[PDB]
């Protein structure tokens, strides 16, 4: 496949961007993919390979190697900086024609510099045996993680382009193998169920849900870079992408790259003494979302070109929470450990299809919403 971009001032930076696939229909076997993105504030590069006929049985072997370097400034560094890289290798086993299992190993390196002091991150750091200040941005951290990844996928829906009956279930999980700096476990389960409502399967009802849980082992916290985020086209639309859930509360501190002409949160050179609540989403260790979509015929399009279009009336529900948030130590501050802060939105959606992939347009308005949540009533994604 094919893409490219650069830029000059979009809010983001230089904006070198690329999505590429080198592939085959038959023969030589390799399936190669490449993603790239360079900004003033990020350098992301992902290289992926897969052999779909690792052996006669049809079993597949897939690996990938990634680099992801984020700098909140450029020229100074000395501000919040998050570099990551790593590798994955996995085996995929078909058994039943409906099913597949997956098992593999992964390694991830994470380097942090000058992270802004906030409660949740620093609860985790304290749990790891690290005690940074909470009064300044002079801190750092560095971890090597090794994980065993597994999964099971069930895909008995009668047709795959535009489903009409049956279910797709996907369970994927991680457990740290001994030797890693972080020690955690994680599970994520996607479920989708299509029930046809007329004999021609032009009206359908889709139920859908995402579940996610995870935690640290033996007294460690789950690494913050593995948190769950909700909101957007993929989960609960009507909200800004990944903004649902716990928000950061910051400790009063001296910011490292300060400028009084700009805006800061609990900066000590703005007069901050107490900790203060913010809009900044930080995700959690637990997540549950659901969605009911009534798929209907298009209210004014003709039927033979409609095989590329789908229309639905939906409502989405969703919540993200942090199990280890201390509801007692921060009495006047909202309980981010409560699961019942369920956001809810409803709207209309149009699952179109570009010649190279399905596209979801949608409008929604969130009606069950909480403070700090950012609304995004008009949504588009691939």
């Amino acid at each position: 496949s094919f893409n490219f971009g650069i830029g000059y001032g979009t809010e983001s930076g230089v904006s070198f961007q690329a999505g590429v696939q080198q592939d085959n229909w038959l023969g030589t076997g390799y399936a190669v993919g490449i993603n790239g993105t360079k900004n003033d504030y990020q350098t992301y590069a992902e290289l992926s390979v897969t052999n779909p006929y690792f052996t006669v049985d049809g079993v597949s072997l897939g690996g990938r190697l990634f680099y992801n370097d984020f700098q909140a400034d450029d020229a100074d560094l000395s501000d919040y900086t998050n570099k990551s890289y790593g590798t994955d290798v996995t085996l995929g086993f078909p058994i039943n024609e409906y099913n597949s299992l997956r098992a593999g190993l992964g390694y991830v390196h994470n380097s942090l510099s000058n992270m802004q002091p906030q409660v949740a991150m620093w609860r985790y750091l304290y749990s790891m045996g690290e005690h940074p200040s909470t009064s300044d941005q002079d801190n750092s951290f560095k971890t090597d993680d090794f994980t065993f990844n597994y999964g099971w996928t069930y895909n008995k829906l009668d047709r795959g382009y535009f489903p009409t009956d049956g279910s797709r279930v996907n369970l994927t999980g991680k457990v740290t193998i001994p030797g890693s700096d972080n020690e955690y476990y994680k599970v994520t389960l996607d479920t989708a169920t299509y029930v046809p409502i007329d004999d021609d399967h032009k009206w359908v009802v889709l139920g859908r849900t995402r579940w996610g849980y995870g935690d640290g082992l033996g007294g460690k916290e789950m690494p913050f870079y593995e948190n769950f985020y909700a909101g957007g086209s993929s989960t609960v639309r009507g909200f800004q992408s990944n903004t649902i859930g716990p928000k950061a509360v910051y400790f009063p501190h001296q910011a490292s790259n300060y400028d009084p002409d700009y805006d800061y949160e609990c900066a000590t050179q703005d007069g901050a003494k107490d900790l203060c609540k913010s809009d900044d989403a930080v995700g959690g260790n637990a997540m549950a979302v659901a969605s009911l979509e009534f798929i209907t015929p298009t209210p004014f399009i003709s039927d033979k070109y409609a095989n590329s279009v789908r229309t639905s009336f939906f409502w989405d529900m969703g919540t993200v929470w942090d199990t280890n948030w201390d509801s007692s130590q921060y009495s006047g501050y909202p309980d981010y450990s409560d699961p019942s802060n369920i956001r809810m939105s409803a709207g209309i959606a149009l699952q179109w299809m570009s010649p190279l992939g399905p596209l979801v347009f949608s409008y929604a308005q969130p009606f069950k919403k909480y403070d700090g949540d950012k609304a995004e009533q008009f949504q588009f994604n691939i």
Binding site: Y41, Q42, D73, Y80, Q116, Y229, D259, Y262, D280
Partner: peptide, 15 residues
């Protein structure tokens, strides 16, 4: 999210 101040904006980089 990574907060960059000189554009008053929160930048998504975890995905």
């Amino acid at each position: 999210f990574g907060t960059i101040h000189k554009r008053r904006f929160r930048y998504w980089f975890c995905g």
